[PDB]
Design an enzyme around this catalytic site. Structure first.
Site, PDB file in Angstrom:
ATOM      1  N   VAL A  33       0.806  -1.221   0.000  1.00  0.00           N
ATOM      2  CA  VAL A  33       0.000   0.000   0.000  1.00  0.00           C
ATOM      3  C   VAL A  33       0.849   1.286   0.000  1.00  0.00           C
ATOM      4  O   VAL A  33       1.855   1.377   0.705  1.00  0.00           O
ATOM      5  CB  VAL A  33      -0.949   0.039   1.212  1.00  0.00           C
ATOM      6  N   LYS A  48      -3.546   0.379  -3.307  1.00  0.00           N
ATOM      7  CA  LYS A  48      -3.111  -0.962  -2.966  1.00  0.00           C
ATOM      8  C   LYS A  48      -2.781  -1.794  -4.182  1.00  0.00           C
ATOM      9  O   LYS A  48      -3.605  -1.943  -5.069  1.00  0.00           O
ATOM     10  CB  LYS A  48      -4.175  -1.688  -2.191  1.00  0.00           C
ATOM     11  N   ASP A 144     -14.748 -11.394  11.169  1.00  0.00           N
ATOM     12  CA  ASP A 144     -13.339 -11.160  11.402  1.00  0.00           C
ATOM     13  C   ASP A 144     -12.932  -9.703  11.671  1.00  0.00           C
ATOM     14  O   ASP A 144     -11.811  -9.323  11.381  1.00  0.00           O
ATOM     15  CB  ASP A 144     -12.521 -11.724  10.254  1.00  0.00           C
TER      16      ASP A 144
HETATM   17  N1  LIG Z   1      -0.185   4.309   9.815  1.00  0.00           N
HETATM   18  C1  LIG Z   1      -1.310   4.840   9.051  1.00  0.00           C
HETATM   19  C2  LIG Z   1      -2.322   3.727   8.833  1.00  0.00           C
HETATM   20  C3  LIG Z   1      -3.443   4.189   7.920  1.00  0.00           C
HETATM   21  C4  LIG Z   1      -2.890   4.651   6.579  1.00  0.00           C
HETATM   22  N2  LIG Z   1      -3.984   5.083   5.717  1.00  0.00           N
HETATM   23  C5  LIG Z   1      -4.703   4.199   5.059  1.00  0.00           C
HETATM   24  N3  LIG Z   1      -5.806   4.593   4.444  1.00  0.00           N
HETATM   25  C6  LIG Z   1      -6.532   3.729   3.789  1.00  0.00           C
HETATM   26  C7  LIG Z   1      -6.147   2.406   3.726  1.00  0.00           C
HETATM   27  C8  LIG Z   1      -4.999   1.997   4.368  1.00  0.00           C
HETATM   28  C9  LIG Z   1      -4.508   0.689   4.362  1.00  0.00           C
HETATM   29  C10 LIG Z   1      -3.405   0.430   5.139  1.00  0.00           C
HETATM   30  C11 LIG Z   1      -2.875  -0.844   5.151  1.00  0.00           C
HETATM   31  C12 LIG Z   1      -3.446  -1.838   4.381  1.00  0.00           C
HETATM   32  N4  LIG Z   1      -4.492  -1.572   3.640  1.00  0.00           N
HETATM   33  C13 LIG Z   1      -5.023  -0.358   3.604  1.00  0.00           C
HETATM   34  O1  LIG Z   1      -6.073  -0.137   2.822  1.00  0.00           O
HETATM   35  C14 LIG Z   1      -6.791  -1.062   2.160  1.00  0.00           C
HETATM   36  C15 LIG Z   1      -7.249  -2.209   2.772  1.00  0.00           C
HETATM   37  C16 LIG Z   1      -8.025  -3.103   2.063  1.00  0.00           C
HETATM   38  C17 LIG Z   1      -8.358  -2.858   0.748  1.00  0.00           C
HETATM   39  N5  LIG Z   1      -9.112  -3.738   0.106  1.00  0.00           N
HETATM   40  S1  LIG Z   1      -8.487  -5.019  -0.651  1.00  0.00           S
HETATM   41  O2  LIG Z   1      -9.357  -5.347  -1.797  1.00  0.00           O
HETATM   42  O3  LIG Z   1      -7.130  -4.678  -1.103  1.00  0.00           O
HETATM   43  C18 LIG Z   1      -8.313  -6.377   0.337  1.00  0.00           C
HETATM   44  C19 LIG Z   1      -9.114  -6.546   1.455  1.00  0.00           C
HETATM   45  C20 LIG Z   1      -8.943  -7.667   2.241  1.00  0.00           C
HETATM   46  C21 LIG Z   1      -7.977  -8.604   1.908  1.00  0.00           C
HETATM   47  C22 LIG Z   1      -7.181  -8.431   0.783  1.00  0.00           C
HETATM   48  C23 LIG Z   1      -7.349  -7.310  -0.009  1.00  0.00           C
HETATM   49  C24 LIG Z   1      -7.913  -1.692   0.137  1.00  0.00           C
HETATM   50  C25 LIG Z   1      -8.225  -1.405  -1.180  1.00  0.00           C
HETATM   51  C26 LIG Z   1      -7.760  -0.239  -1.778  1.00  0.00           C
HETATM   52  C27 LIG Z   1      -6.986   0.653  -1.071  1.00  0.00           C
HETATM   53  C28 LIG Z   1      -6.678   0.368   0.238  1.00  0.00           C
HETATM   54  C29 LIG Z   1      -7.131  -0.795   0.843  1.00  0.00           C
HETATM   55  N6  LIG Z   1      -4.311   2.924   5.018  1.00  0.00           N
HETATM   56  C30 LIG Z   1      -1.944   5.807   6.813  1.00  0.00           C
HETATM   57  C31 LIG Z   1      -0.801   5.370   7.712  1.00  0.00           C
END
Ligand SMILES: N[C@H]1CC[C@H](Nc2nccc(-c3cccnc3Oc3ccc(NS(=O)(=O)c4ccccc4)c4ccccc34)n2)CC1
Length: 337
Positions: A33, A48, A144
């Site tokens: 990310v 992501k 979850d």
């Molecule tokens: N220390 C701080 C934490 C928050 C951070 N800001 C932020 N804003 C939005 C999202 C996230 C984030 C951080 C870590 C991991 N994922 C994050 O976001 C997402 C989680 C799941 C998503 N969905 S998924 O389809 O990728 C997904 C969900 C579950 C399992 C596998 C994939 C996201 C999709 C698009 C963009 C971001 C996504 N982080 C800034 C720094």
């Protein structure tokens, strides 16, 4: 068509995104990310990268369910997609999917390490419950929820980042009925919210454990051995194991969550403290048949000061196995439409 994209090195990986997304900074790894400025919307976003999400059925089913569900739901307390794209031009060359959402400031792990007033804690809780109710109304039971998949902004607004487990790794927040394989209903998600609430108060994980055995022991030794009616809903094997555990009466909630853990200097905060403690006691209840529902938690006085029909009552199918190559197709059609 590919001159629409540019590549940059981020750590050990390479991001290839639309030119509109600028100044990428890494903010999470485990897909990868990045934060970015989006010149078309004039705001910051999170990007992501899913690398070969069709590489196995676990990654692929999850990625696909996530993408599809992002269209089955529009609600301010749930992740929303601004953009989906792949830099690859044909099904045959397809490798990566990029997903874009609004950039948030923090996840709940970080907020858990902070002291919070009651107005903030209660508002966070309210929003979680709204998101869950919206999900449940769509037929989605998450099972979850955990601090790492909830994110917040500085103004205390909150979003749930994923859609949970399918109808068919950190586990401290999983309900008893999940942990014991017993069947469940909507209020399976109340348990997790109670685990999160309890952790926000205590600043320590409630039921830590290297495996489910450990976890189950930490649950009964604090909450007590559950009633016979509950035991009699377990399968012979699991019931044997659970009933042959060392028994416990458990502790009451004033002992589990002492008065010194809350802000209680003023009369306002003393009252909110006992109300917080009351809600916890309705949420961390082992037997789902006795645990408060989502609608009832929204009506509770600790939470209901925020109530707003607009946010609470907004309007709202196969799940199957496939090979790699079939997943790659399903997923590529979803990112292309
Ligand atoms: N220390 C701080 C934490 C928050 C951070 N800001 C932020 N804003 C939005 C999202 C996230 C984030 C951080 C870590 C991991 N994922 C994050 O976001 C997402 C989680 C799941 C998503 N969905 S998924 O389809 O990728 C997904 C969900 C579950 C399992 C596998 C994939 C996201 C999709 C698009 C963009 C971001 C996504 N982080 C800034 C720094």
């Amino acid at each position: 068509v590919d001159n629409q994209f540019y590549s940059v090195e981020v750590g050990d990986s390479t991001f290839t995104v639309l030119k509109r997304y600028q100044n990428l900074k890494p903010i999470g790894s485990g897909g990868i990310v990045c934060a970015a400025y989006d010149a078309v919307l004039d705001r910051n976003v999170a990007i992501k990268k899913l690398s070969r999400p069709f590489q196995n059925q676990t990654h692929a089913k999850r990625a696909y369910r996530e993408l599809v569900l992002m269209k089955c739901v529009n609600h301010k307390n749930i992740i929303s997609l601004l953009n989906v794209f792949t830099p690859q031009k044909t099904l045959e060359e397809f490798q990566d999917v990029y997903l874009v959402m609004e950039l948030m400031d923090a996840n709940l792990c970080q907020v858990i390490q902070m002291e919070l007033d009651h107005e903030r804690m209660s508002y966070l809780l309210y929003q979680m419950l709204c998101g869950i109710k919206h999900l449940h109304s769509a037929g989605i039971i998450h099972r979850d929820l955990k601090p790492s998949n909830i994110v917040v902004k500085s103004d205390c607004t909150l979003k749930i980042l994923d859609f949970g487990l399918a109808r068919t790794v950190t586990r401290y927040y999983r309900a008893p009925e999940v942990i014991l394989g017993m069947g469940y209903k909507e209020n399976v998600d109340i348990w997790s919210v109670g685990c999160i609430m309890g952790e926000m108060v205590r600043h320590k994980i409630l039921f830590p454990g290297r495996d489910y055995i450990d976890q189950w022991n930490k649950v009964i030794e604090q909450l007590g051995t559950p009633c016979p009616e509950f035991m009699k809903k377990l399968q012979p094997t699991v019931r044997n194991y659970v009933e042959n555990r060392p028994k416990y009466a458990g502790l009451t909630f004033p002992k589990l969550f002492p008065d010194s853990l809350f802000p209680a200097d003023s009369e306002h905060n003393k009252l909110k403290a006992s109300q917080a403690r009351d809600l916890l006691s309705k949420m961390l209840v082992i037997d789902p048949a006795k645990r408060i529902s989502v609608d009832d938690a929204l009506q509770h006085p600790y939470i209901n000061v925020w109530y707003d029909p607009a946010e609470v009552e907004a309007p709202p199918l196969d799940e199957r196995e496939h090979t790699i190559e079939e997943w790659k197709e399903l997923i590529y059609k979803e990112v292309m439409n």
